[PDB]
Amino acid sequence: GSTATGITVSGAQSFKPVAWQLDNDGNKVNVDNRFATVTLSATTGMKRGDKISFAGVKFLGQMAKNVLAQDATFSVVRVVDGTHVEITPKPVALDDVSLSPEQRAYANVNTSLADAMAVNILNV
Predict the structure, then answer these.
(1) How many domains does the chain have?
(2) Torsion, CA 101, CA 102, CA 106, CA 108, rounded to 10
(3) Do the beta carbons of residue 104 and residue 55 sit within 8 Å?
(4) How many Å from the N-terminal Cα to the C-terminal Cα in the chain?
(5) Positions of the region I domain?
């Protein structure tokens, strides 16, 4: 035991990675592109190379077949503040109209991290 976390998100966040075509966003600096810095209530007990899942956030295509579709499985790279982690790749929602068409191709998850998502480490 002592593997399950079940901690809740602290705020809603949706970051977008810089695409090949910098048409909509021509951000010159390369930061927070492939990594996603997750702001959660608590992220203590997590370590680099661990498995965290976001309840409700999952990949496009899963729900079309898997009724009990697994949640977004991302690998943590570093626990920054112990209430703030950096994972990769970065979760981007296809349902989010805030992004440009190009970004929709890069979109991997259905929904962005809203302020009520549970973050649980999978035991394996």
Answers:
(1) 1
(2) 0
(3) no
(4) 11
(5) 2-124
Of residues 39, 40, 21, 48, the one with CA closest to residue 103: 21
Experimental method: NMR
Tokens of 5: 């976390």
Strand-pairing partners, residue 120, are 53
**Sole residue written with tokens 């729900």:** 63
- Residue 121 sits in which domain range? 1-124
Distance CA 22, CA 46 (A): 34
Q: What is the CATH number of the domain that holds 81?
A: 2.40.30.240
Do β-strands 72-79 and 7-8 pair in parallel, antiparallel, or remain unpaired? unpaired
Helices of type H across the chain: 101-106
Q: Report in angstroms the alpha-carbon separations of 41 from 9, 19, 70, 101, 109.
A: 6, 30, 22, 32, 22
Residue found by looking up tokens 């068409």 in the block: 101
